[PDB]
Design a protein around this nucleic acid. Structure first.
Ligand SMILES: [Ca+2]
Length: 976
DNA sequence: CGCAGCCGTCCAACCAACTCAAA
DNA sequence: GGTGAGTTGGTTGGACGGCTGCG
């Protein structure tokens, strides 16, 4: 081939690592540990009693393939050549081609020029509607950056643009390493343009050199090593972003059409021996050969692989957590389920097994009954053969989407550690590209218990359902079984990691039980994936933000806003510089008068719009605004000690304000269609409106993150300053206008029915970041739910400006304020809401958890306890030491007395009082020694001097000093 | 009877182990 | 990616108060 394929298509030799337990009639002395040594035969697969080599492609293969090429052999049917008109892009790659490298391919001159002598090529990855895999390579996208003309001319004595091209070329030749060679001024194109720096209102338009560069590597050097005295603009912008922004309409995910170019040129199909990727067909084109295909929105037949690995620790402890760098800690099985992402149908069930494995009739009957495919079990003699066969599947079937549970944190890191460290397989050919592609995992950072990681593989969207579900569903435990019982309501089986070595050693039937359990977990995760449809959300954000779905997952929130801002800033002639290097506090207490929550709809975005906040409307200096009129043409605001100014929208409209304005218009338009739309559309529209929400809410954070892409702490500080002043204005208005019931009634004549017995008062009692809680003494809760909408409306007219809206969320009938962001309350509908508090403690026993709930539930649902709890707030805490406790709390005390009785009673259901831990270590002293579970294992409290199981959970219950348990532990301390 | 020394008790801070959470 | 797991429970050290001994 023209570019070498770097994945394995042939293999004669490998490091054979396999458990000695797989050898039949081995004596017990040999039936332990692993073989580890080289073997000189082809890697091999056994399936249903047939054998094939792993890397043999042809008829009879034990797993499906969607690969045209294998090791440069074209396995397409004779004369295969599908016409491509429309195709759906899901991911975009950017790579440097060199005309010299491609000289043996049959490419037209108009492509060769765009890579002469080098150039970035954008590769669109997709399917046709018939399910043919396509790559379209787009030529001609130069990256570019700007520098101020007067600073450049003065700094390095340039007269005309080709001088700057020579200066940059020289700065490449003279690099500290030999990293840039073959350079000329022609690697650059430079032109003079007029632009304005995005920062500050006073800033004049100036002449900049816009410099075009052929490679992101060349750019990254000039934007760090060349004239660092001169500030640079948009040097961090990648070729993908330039491609998406420079062509109106274009998207990183969606349907496209091939079409004639400006000189009636066409896309050129590549020959098979010139393919860059594992695709059925490939094309060269330029961006004028492309258009969006409007009216297509159905996803094509992409394939999803859901996978899960089982591992067995092979060292001195068979029950320790396995470590990939220890050769003897093996991958023993991999379940791999292949779905069609468009129909949601499970198409294949593959189980890779080290050692023979016979799946149970029970399991095979259950799958057949559920209508699912019959599993193919693939058996391997060694761990290398298995990992190579899984990676061979990944390259040959090429699943566009991959999922699993903790696949980023464990399964991929363990596999790729094994493949790179133990075995020495180059991963750069195992993605969509045939070599030199990204295939990498990395650790997030200093996070020691929560080991967390990211992955990028070219052309493969990794979505981990652990990430999706932790980001969505509030749960006590995120173990996959706990999630299956919570989300799918489905009580599936367990096999412990402690059971696995005992099962694995027994024989093929017991290794089958490991298979059943492994398959079943991948099925649960597939069902979770197609419940949440997370690809549709990530797709929606990718389309909206103008970034690929890969960056949508693995990069932060900032790049989303940055890319949108960059498009808009360009339209308006701005350029973005490359970044260098209290009365609201709750008096805690219990309220039995209704509490209305007012809450600002999207406070920070609505402030940004209302007050026209932006980089480009800010000023720090009065002579910037001395020609304008105060209050009319600009806002003045003291923020963090500085006097900031922001010109109002009719002087200059904020770029942030325009982004937010336009997004919220789209969100309305979509949500207006949802009730009319067909149920297939209704889910898509729901994903679109959700994508817009997360992008809007990220604007505030984007400005506030220092050393971010485009920071402006003055805007973030003004947003939060205005937010604080708005909450106090809300409090002052509410207190001043509605001091007396008559004033409320004059504004809302409904209040005549609402009026409850006793004194009327209406006071703010808590104020969050963007909500206010109003204690409505002397009003009934029922009508107050409705009057709150009209109050919130009236406040939003009297105060504030048209993008800002205060809304009535909810009415508590009873509320316990505990602290900032901690409260419990019962809503008017009877539902209890708990915020910032856990009433069940994970380390406590059932007796304590249930009794804790009983006390809180009684405070909220017994009005006698509620009223008496309100009476407590009449006095300081110390005075209730002297005075008798208020009448009505006796029923609350009664639950404590009852629970106390139930400790020291016969017929104590001891099972409610069982604490628990798993011993895990060896059972002797360590440091702290007296760990309860050790003294109910080793120095056993109640019973004989040893306990059978070292790695499972010790149940234990505390008991009285008795001159019997004392003697037991005090003598066991001597036995020791 | 007063003062000094020693012992006991209480409080605060730090360190270690468990938990998921993958096996 | 910047903060460390939270959490608790046990152990050690320091301070304060009370009782006993000595002058
Ligand atoms: Ca997993």
């Amino acid at each position: 081939p023209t570019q070498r394929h770097t994945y394995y298509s042939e293999c004669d030799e490998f490091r054979f690592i396999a458990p000695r337990v797989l050898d039949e009639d081995a004596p017990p002395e040999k039936r332990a540990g692993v073989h580890d040594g080289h073997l000189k035969r082809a890697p091999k697969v056994y399936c249903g009693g047939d054998e094939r080599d792993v890397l043999r492609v042809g008829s009879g293969g034990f797993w499906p393939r969607r690969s045209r090429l294998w090791g440069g052999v074209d396995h397409a049917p004779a004369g295969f050549n599908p016409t491509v008109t429309v195709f759906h892009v899901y991911d975009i790659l950017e790579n440097v081609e060199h005309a010299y490298g491609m000289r043996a391919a049959q490419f037209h001159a108009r492509f060769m020029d765009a890579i002469t002598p080098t150039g970035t090529v954008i590769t669109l990855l997709g399917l046709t509607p018939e399910g043919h895999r396509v790559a379209v390579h787009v030529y001609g996208t130069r990256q570019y950056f700007y520098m101020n003309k007067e600073e450049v001319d003065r700094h390095l004595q340039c007269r005309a643009p080709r001088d700057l091209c020579e200066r940059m070329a020289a700065a490449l030749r003279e690099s500290p390493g030999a990293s840039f060679r073959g350079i000329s001024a022609d690697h650059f194109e430079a032109e003079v343009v007029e632009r304005t720096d995005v920062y500050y209102y006073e800033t004049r338009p100036a002449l900049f050199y816009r410099v075009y560069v052929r490679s992101g590597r060349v750019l990254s050097y000039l934007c760090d090593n060349f004239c660092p005295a001169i500030k640079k603009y948009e040097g961090g912008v990648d070729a993908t972003t330039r491609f998406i922004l420079d062509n109106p309409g274009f998207v990183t995910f969606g349907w496209y059409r091939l079409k004639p170019g400006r000189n009636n040129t066409l896309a050129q199909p590549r020959a098979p021996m010139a393919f860059g990727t594992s695709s059925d067909v490939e094309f060269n084109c330029t961006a004028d050969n492309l258009a969006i295909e409007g009216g297509m929105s159905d996803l094509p037949a992409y394939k999803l692989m859901c996978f899960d690995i089982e591992c067995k620790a092979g060292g001195e402890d068979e029950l320790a957590f396995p470590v990939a760098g220890h050769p003897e800690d093996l991958v023993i099985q991999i379940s791999c389920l292949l779905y069609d992402l468009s129909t949601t149908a499970l198409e294949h069930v593959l189980l890779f097994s080290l050692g023979s494995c016979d799946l149970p009739e029970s399991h095979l009957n259950e799958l057949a009954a559920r209508g699912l495919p019959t599993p193919v079990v693939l058996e391997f003699d060694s761990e290398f053969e298995m990992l190579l066969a899984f990676m061979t599947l990944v390259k040959q079937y090429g699943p566009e989407f991959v999922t699993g549970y903790n696949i980023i944190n464990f399964d991929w890191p363990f596999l790729l550690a094994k493949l790179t460290d133990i075995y020495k397989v180059p991963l750069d050919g195992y993605g969509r590209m045939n070599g030199r592609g990204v295939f990498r995992v990395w650790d997030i950072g200093q996070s020691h218990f929560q080991k967390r990681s990211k992955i990028k593989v070219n052309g493969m969207v990794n979505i981990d359902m652990y990430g999706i579900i932790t980001d969505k569903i509030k749960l006590s435990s995120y173990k996959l079984n706990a999630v299956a019982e919570a989300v799918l309501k489905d009580k599936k089986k367990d096999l412990s990691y402690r059971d696995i070595p005992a099962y694995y050693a027994a024989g093929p039937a017991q290794r089958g039980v490991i298979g059943e359990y492994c398959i079943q977990d991948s099925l649960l995760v597939g069902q979770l994936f197609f419940k949440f449809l997370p690809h549709l959300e990530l797709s929606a954000v990718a389309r909206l933000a103008g970034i690929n779905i890969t960056r949508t997952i693995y990069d932060g929130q900032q790049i989303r806003v940055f890319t949108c801002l960059l498009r808009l800033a360009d339209q308006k002639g701005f350029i973005l510089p490359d970044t260098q290097g209290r009365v609201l506090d709750p008096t805690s207490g219990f309220h039995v008068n209704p509490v209305v929550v007012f809450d600002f709809a999207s406070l920070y975005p609505s402030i940004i719009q209302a007050h026209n906040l932006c980089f480009s409307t800010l000023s720090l200096r009065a002579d910037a605004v001395a020609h304008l009129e105060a209050g009319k043409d600009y806002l003045e605001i003291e923020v963090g000690g500085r006097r900031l100014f922001f010109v109002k929208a009719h002087v200059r409209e904020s770029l942030l304000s325009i982004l937010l304005r336009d997004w919220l218009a789209m969100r309305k338009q979509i949500r207006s269609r949802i009730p009319q739309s067909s149920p297939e559309e209704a889910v898509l529209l729901d994903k679109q409106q959700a994508a817009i929400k997360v992008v809007c809410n990220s604007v505030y954070g984007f400005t506030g993150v220092q050393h971010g892409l485009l920071p402006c702490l003055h805007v973030a500080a003004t947003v939060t300053t205005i937010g604080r002043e708005m909450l106090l204005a809300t409090r002052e208005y509410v207190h001043a206008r509605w001091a007396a019931f008559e004033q409320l009634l004059a504004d809302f004549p409904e209040a005549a029915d609402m009026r409850a017995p006793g004194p009327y008062s209406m006071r703010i009692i808590y104020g969050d970041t963007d909500s206010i809680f109003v204690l409505c003494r002397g009003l009934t809760a029922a009508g107050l739910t409705a009057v709150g909408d009209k109050m919130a409306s009236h406040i939003s007219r009297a105060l504030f400006l048209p993008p800002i809206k205060l809304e009535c969320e909810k009415t508590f009938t009873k509320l316990l304020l505990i602290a900032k962001k901690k409260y419990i309350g019962v809503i008017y509908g009877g539902k209890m809401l708990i915020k910032g508090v856990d009433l069940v403690r994970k380390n406590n026993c059932a007796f304590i958890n249930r009794t804790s709930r009983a006390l809180v539930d009684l405070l909220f649902y017994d009005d006698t306890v509620s009223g008496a709890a309100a009476a407590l707030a009449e006095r300081p805490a110390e005075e209730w030491l002297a005075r008798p406790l208020p009448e009505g709390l006796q029923a609350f005390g009664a639950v404590l007395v009852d629970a106390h009785r139930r400790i020291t009673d016969p017929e104590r259901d001891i099972q409610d009082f069982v604490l628990t831990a798993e011993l895990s270590r060896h059972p002797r002293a360590y440091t702290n020694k007296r760990l309860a579970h050790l003294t109910v294992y080793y120095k056993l409290m109640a019973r004989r001097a040893q306990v059978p199981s070292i790695k499972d959970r010790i149940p234990y219950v505390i008991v009285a000093q008795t001159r019997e348990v004392e003697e037991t532990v005090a003598r066991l301390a001597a036995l020791r």
